[PDB]
Amino acid sequence: VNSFSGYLKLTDNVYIKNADIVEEAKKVKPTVVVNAANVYLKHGGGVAGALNKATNNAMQVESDDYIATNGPLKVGGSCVLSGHNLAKHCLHVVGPNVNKGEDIQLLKSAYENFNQHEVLLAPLLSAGIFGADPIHSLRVCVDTVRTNVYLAVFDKNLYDKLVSSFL
Ligand SMILES: OC[C@H]1CC2(CN1c1ncnc3[nH]ccc13)OCCO2
Ligand SMILES: [Cl-]
């Protein structure tokens, strides 16, 4: 039993809700919140910009030190950093950006990072300003993640369509 509330159950392990991931994280304080990161951990917009803003830019400061030490992530890769005031940890995961020409096949690799954590709060990878079809992102999530994932989705219109079309 966990403290997540109001989610629709899609499969044995995948749940979904129309919600702002920032407000969800502040309420639940999950062990792991997933960020929709880029390889440079430059948290300017989308989910990343919103999460970073909620940390008063502490996420960006920590991220800049991470990159200075380790260099950029890989598309499809991830790193674990602090969750600051939002969660214990933040798993920064880089889905392929279709608007950068990046290979959508890498979306499965991106979701595989979730399997290293027993429970996560997460957005649909490569969705939103990353330019991929969110219905496709959901399908890859369900077919790749085996651990317990709670998908937020703040956009109301995006959610009803994802539910109604889910197979
Ligand atoms: O999960 C979906 C991703 C992708 C997105 C934004 N997303 C968010 N998900 C959850 N909480 C959020 N807070 C702020 C943004 C956001 O949806 C439509 C446009 O891009
Ligand atoms: Cl995003």
UniProtKB/Swiss-Prot annotation:
Domain Macro: 1-167
Reaction catalysis annotation: Thiol-dependent hydrolysis of ester, thioester, amide, peptide and isopeptide bonds formed by the C-terminal Gly of ubiquitin (a 76-residue protein attached to proteins as an intracellular targeting signal)
Compartment(s) where it occurs, according to its Swiss-Prot or TrEMBL record: Host endoplasmic reticulum membrane
Membrane topology type: Multi-pass membrane protein
Activity regulation, free text: Inhibited in vitro by GRL-0617.
Entry function: Responsible for the cleavages located at the N-terminus of the replicase polyprotein. Participates together with nsp4 in the assembly of virally-induced cytoplasmic double-membrane vesicles necessary for viral replication. Antagonizes innate immune induction of type I interferon by blocking the phosphorylation, dimerization and subsequent nuclear translocation of host IRF3. Also prevents host NF-kappa-B signaling. In addition, PL-PRO possesses a deubiquitinating/deISGylating activity and processes both 'Lys-48'- and 'Lys-63'-linked polyubiquitin chains from cellular substrates.
Summary of subunit composition and partner proteins: May form homohexamers. Interacts with N protein.
Protein name in the entry: Papain-like protease nsp3
Source organism: Severe acute respiratory syndrome coronavirus 2 (2019-nCoV)
This protein's encoding gene: rep
Shown segment, full-protein numbering: 1025 to 1191 of 7096
